[PDB]
Amino acid sequence: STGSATTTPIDSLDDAYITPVQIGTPAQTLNLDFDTGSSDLWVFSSETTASEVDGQTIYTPSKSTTAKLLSGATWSISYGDGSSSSGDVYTDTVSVGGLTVTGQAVESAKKVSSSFTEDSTIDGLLGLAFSTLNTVSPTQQKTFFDNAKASLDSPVFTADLGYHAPGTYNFGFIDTTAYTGSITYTAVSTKQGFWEWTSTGYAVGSGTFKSTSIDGIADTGTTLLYLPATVVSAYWAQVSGAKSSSSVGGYVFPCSATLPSFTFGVGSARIVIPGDYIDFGPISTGSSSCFGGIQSSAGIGINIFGDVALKAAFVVFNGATTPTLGFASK
């Protein structure tokens, strides 16, 4: 089997992407944030504290004839941005772009933090990291990908995120029309539960390539590109007037600038992030100070190849017995 679904930016800045997901019988369609940096499928629901729901579409398990309470199961998660959610668990039928899993753990939110409430466009998350990170207790649950894997034509999914435009998540096949040149595969460590790999270096604009190992994670659920302070300083030093602002919480730059591209290495291959991808617009409405899309990972504890990087590539998440990551230009 295979699945194919369109993923759509939630706003004009590509702050996140939502993908429609069918849950239950009859289908309840929710727009979820596909997140290769976490491993829980959780949804706004009929159980969510009413004051914490503001515009989202909710899952009502009592209206699904295939929903079954997973007795005794609870979940609780906190993300790297400080947001959180928690609740109980159902199993139900879940389909993505034509691909169907029965008995998928659907984690029903009883509580969500304010950032989730304030984002009316995201109805929940669908985790695509390794199932070892799943928070369900006392019996850890498998991700959608994990559950589908054996049935897929090939044990892979691919992320093809758009710049200010829709893109695609495919399951079970590689669309050879969706990229240019070749796919370069690189090793993955699953020891932290992430799609963790090592970039071979970087370049700023038309500058020379710096060969240096950068360990980080391929994370569709993170907006920006988070890299070591040395690398990030070298980038923003090429933008007149750019500076790190502790009051804003990162590098800002004059909205009148033309940003340079940023290249990262995948083995001997190179992915180029156009400068426009690195502009996240005014820090506040009407400001001429703009927020940068490349930020320091210092104090995160890990480097993160978020959407800014990933949307510049066609990315293969290869879930073979020995997982690997593949990157192509497009």
Same domain assignment for residues 49 and 69 = yes
Check: CB of residue 17 under 8 Å from CB of residue 9. yes
Same domain assignment for residues 252 and 274 = yes
Same domain assignment for residues 158 and 179 = no
Q: Is 261 tagged catalytic?
A: no
State how far the alpha carbon of 40 is from the alpha carbons of 67, 89, 96, 238, 311, in Å: 17, 11, 15, 39, 23
CA proximity to 226, closest of 307, 303, 292: 303
Same domain assignment for residues 157 and 302 = no
Same domain assignment for residues 141 and 228 = no
Same domain assignment for residues 163 and 62 = yes
Residue ending a domain, choose from 120, 153, 174: 174
Same domain assignment for residues 168 and 224 = no
Same domain assignment for residues 244 and 123 = no
Cα separation of 80 and 69, whole Å?
A: 29
| Residue found by looking up tokens 């959608």 in the block | 144
- Identify the domain containing residue 152 by its residue range: 5-174
Same domain assignment for residues 26 and 160 = yes
**Half-sphere exposure of residue 231, counting CA atoms within 13 Å on the CB side?**
26
Q: Is 233 tagged catalytic?
A: no
Overall domain count for the chain: 2
Which of the residues 14, 33, 35, 307 is marked catalytic? 35
CATH of the domain at 144: 2.40.70.10
Same domain assignment for residues 296 and 193 = yes
Residue ending a domain, choose from 174, 201, 236: 174
Experimental approach was: X-ray
Same domain assignment for residues 129 and 185 = no
Q: Is 322 exposed, middle or buried (0-12, 13-18, 19+ CB in 10 A)?
A: exposed
Q: Is 270 exposed, middle or buried (0-12, 13-18, 19+ CB in 10 A)?
A: middle
State how far the alpha carbon of 260 is from the alpha carbons of 205, 235, 249, 279, in Å: 5, 8, 21, 10
Declared resolution, Å: 1.7
Q: How many CB atoms lie within 10 A of CB 10?
A: 16
Same domain assignment for residues 180 and 327 = yes
Residue ending a domain, choose from 145, 174, 203: 174
Cα separation of 142 and 131, whole Å?
A: 5
State how far the alpha carbon of 136 is from the alpha carbons of 89, 96, 131, 142, 204, in Å: 8, 22, 10, 9, 42
Which of the residues 199, 261, 296, 297 is marked catalytic? 199
What's at 215, amino acid-wise?
D
